[PDB]
Each structure stands twice: as structure tokens, then as C-alpha cells.
Design an enzyme around this catalytic site. Structure first.
Site, PDB file in Angstrom:
ATOM      1  N   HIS A  61       0.803  -1.227   0.000  1.00  0.00           N
ATOM      2  CA  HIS A  61       0.000   0.000   0.000  1.00  0.00           C
ATOM      3  C   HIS A  61       0.836   1.277   0.000  1.00  0.00           C
ATOM      4  O   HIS A  61       0.407   2.297  -0.538  1.00  0.00           O
ATOM      5  CB  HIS A  61      -1.072   0.018   1.100  1.00  0.00           C
ATOM      6  N   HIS A  91       6.552   6.911   6.118  1.00  0.00           N
ATOM      7  CA  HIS A  91       5.998   6.551   4.826  1.00  0.00           C
ATOM      8  C   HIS A  91       5.323   7.776   4.233  1.00  0.00           C
ATOM      9  O   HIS A  91       5.231   8.837   4.875  1.00  0.00           O
ATOM     10  CB  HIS A  91       4.976   5.415   4.964  1.00  0.00           C
ATOM     11  N   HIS A  93       2.023   9.229   1.437  1.00  0.00           N
ATOM     12  CA  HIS A  93       0.830   9.011   0.638  1.00  0.00           C
ATOM     13  C   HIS A  93       0.934   9.960  -0.538  1.00  0.00           C
ATOM     14  O   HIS A  93       1.290  11.125  -0.359  1.00  0.00           O
ATOM     15  CB  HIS A  93      -0.425   9.332   1.440  1.00  0.00           C
ATOM     16  N   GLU A 103      -3.277  13.633   2.441  1.00  0.00           N
ATOM     17  CA  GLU A 103      -4.387  13.105   3.217  1.00  0.00           C
ATOM     18  C   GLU A 103      -5.060  14.256   3.953  1.00  0.00           C
ATOM     19  O   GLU A 103      -6.250  14.518   3.747  1.00  0.00           O
ATOM     20  CB  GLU A 103      -3.896  12.004   4.156  1.00  0.00           C
ATOM     21  N   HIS A 116       4.448  10.940   6.594  1.00  0.00           N
ATOM     22  CA  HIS A 116       4.053  10.615   7.953  1.00  0.00           C
ATOM     23  C   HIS A 116       5.199   9.950   8.693  1.00  0.00           C
ATOM     24  O   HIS A 116       5.612   8.853   8.338  1.00  0.00           O
ATOM     25  CB  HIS A 116       2.831   9.691   7.956  1.00  0.00           C
ATOM     26  N   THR A 195      -4.359   6.456   9.438  1.00  0.00           N
ATOM     27  CA  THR A 195      -5.189   6.660   8.241  1.00  0.00           C
ATOM     28  C   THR A 195      -5.309   5.414   7.366  1.00  0.00           C
ATOM     29  O   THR A 195      -5.971   5.447   6.316  1.00  0.00           O
ATOM     30  CB  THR A 195      -4.696   7.845   7.377  1.00  0.00           C
ATOM     31  N   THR A 196      -4.665   4.329   7.797  1.00  0.00           N
ATOM     32  CA  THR A 196      -4.830   3.011   7.182  1.00  0.00           C
ATOM     33  C   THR A 196      -5.472   2.043   8.170  1.00  0.00           C
ATOM     34  O   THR A 196      -5.263   2.165   9.382  1.00  0.00           O
ATOM     35  CB  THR A 196      -3.482   2.406   6.754  1.00  0.00           C
TER      36      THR A 196
END
Ligand code: RU
Ligand code: ZN
Length: 257
Positions: A61, A91, A93, A103, A116, A195-196
């Protein structure tokens, strides 16, 4: 299982993870004219001098840069935080296009990407225990916009070739996360979640106001990663962001006037 596609994306997550419709979900839109300067916030302390990175993993992901968190080294303290929070991984996004990918949003503005840096509260002994607590985690969020290259990011960019597909990892020692920070540590803060999935509501969010600039060539290399595993049909790792969630009751505080 969960992903970002039509059939397994953010709109579907609530079925396996009912907390997805919870009371403190992330990310959120930061409405700059509703956020209030908070004089009770202490100075933010980002201490990444002794940071010990271990490796980089494509987890299907995103990609995680993991750190050795068995000692107090890379730590986040001050600001809205009580005590010491240890860096465990970072990581990103990002989007399929420069106009989307972050995000958190700022007055509905979407950035090209979001970094993040995940930390856990050392009072809880380890990560697994921290994520059972409402103050278990602190995440430092940093926006990415497309402009000049970020030199501190190139080492990450160069290694992505070796972790194209899900489950691949590479040695990633001696990476200094200080190179990923903007000049100012001005920030917004609110209580939120990961957020995952499993979207655990354990996070004190600290979202920096100043974005970092990365080059078009750098983000393009992010977009060459794969959601799929080796020898599977190619699914470009893009648009791995969750959209803004209801703020409900929460107040976003600003560190700056
Ligand atoms: Ru995954
Ligand atoms: Zn994240």
C-alpha cells in the site's frame, strides 16, 4: 483485503474496521480560519540526530522506512505532547497527479503528497501496547509540493527500484530523516487516528504548515512503484491516500499566531 481501489478502497473499510466511522478519524481538512492559536503549547522538539534506520519495505500500500526503536534515539517531544515519543517508521501518501495525494488538506487544498513520521509513546513499552492507548502515538505530518528537488529525499528515491513490488525490502541503514524537514516547525495539532486500517484512534497529529518541495522526477519515481506482488499484473502504486473525514467536536489548534 483492504486497498485504495474501487472495490476495496476507503469507502469499503468500515465493514472490516467499524472504527472507520468513529469519533476521531483522520485525516481531516484543516480550516485555517477555525483553528485557534494555543498559547499553552510548548516548543516542538524534533530530535533525529541519532536516528537509526534499518530498511525499506514495500508493504503493498506504501513503502515504510523502518527505524531501530529499541533505545531512545530519534524522538518527538514538546508541543501538544506529554513525555517522549520514539520514531518507528516513516511513509508517504501520494497521488497519480500533482493536484492530489495528501491526506490532510488545508482550506480544502490537496498537496501532491504527504509524509508521515510515526512515533510511539515510551511510557507504554512498545508500539503494540501504545496502539491500545488514546495517547499512544504521535505522527508528524509534512506536505509535499512539486518544485525543486529535495536532496534529503534522493536516497529514498534511488532505492525504490529494488522494492518495486509488494513484499520486497532492501537494507536502508544510515538514513537521516532530518533531511526531510522544512525550515519552520509551525504546526496544527488535533487528536486523530492512523489513516490506514485498522484506523486505530491513538494519534496526536502534528501537521507542519510549511510544505517541502520535491522534484517532478522524484514524485514520478514514487508513481512507478507497484501495489501488486512480483509476477502479478501491474497496478501502479498511486492514489494511496484516504480523503478527509468528519472533524466532529474536535478542535484543531495552531502553534503560531
Ligand atoms: Ru497493504
Ligand atoms: Zn500515513
Amino acid at each position: 483485503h483492504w486497498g485504495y481501489g474501487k472495490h476495496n478502497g476507503p469507502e469499503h473499510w468500515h465493514k472490516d474496521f467499524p472504527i472507520a466511522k468513529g469519533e476521531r478519524q483522520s485525516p481531516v481538512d484543516i480550516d485555517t480560519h477555525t483553528a485557534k492559536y494555543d498559547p499553552s503549547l510548548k516548543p516542538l522538539s524534533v530530535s533525529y540526530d541519532q536516528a537509526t534506520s534499518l530498511r525499506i519495505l514495500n508493504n503493498g500500500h506504501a513503502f515504510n522506512v523502518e527505524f531501530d526503536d529499541s533505545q531512545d534515539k530519534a524522538v518527538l517531544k514538546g508541543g501538544p505532547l506529554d513525555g517522549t515519543y520514539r520514531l518507528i517508521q516513516f511513509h508517504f501518501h501520494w497521488g497519480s497527479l500533482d493536484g492530489q495525494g495528501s491526506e490532510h488538506t488545508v482550506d480544502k487544498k490537496k498537496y501532491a503528497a504527504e509524509l508521515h513520521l510515526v512515533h510511539w509513546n515510551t511510557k507504554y513499552g512498545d508500539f503494540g501496547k501504545a496502539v491500545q492507548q488514546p495517547d499512544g502515538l504521535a505522527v508528524l505530518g509534512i506536505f509535499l509540493k512539486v518544485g525543486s528537488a529535495k536532496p534529503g529525499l534522493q536516497k529514498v528515491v534511488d532505492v525504490l527500484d529494488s522494492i518495486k513490488t509488494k513484499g520486497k525490502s532492501a537494507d536502508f541503514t544510515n538514513f537521516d530523516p532530518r533531511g526531510l524537514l522544512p525550515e519552520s516547525l509551525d504546526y496544527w495539532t488535533y487528536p486523530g487516528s492512523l489513516t490506514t486500517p485498522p484506523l486505530l484512534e491513538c494519534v496526536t497529529w502534528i501537521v507542519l504548515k510549511e510544505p517541502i518541495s520535491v522534484s517532478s522526477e522524484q514524485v514520478l519515481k514514487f508513481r512507478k512503484l507497484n501495489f501488486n506482488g512480483e509476477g502479478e499484473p501491474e497496478e501502479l502504486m498511486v492514489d494511496n491516500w484516504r480523503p478527509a473525514q468528519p472533524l466532529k467536536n474536535r478542535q484543531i489548534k495552531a502553534s503560531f499566531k
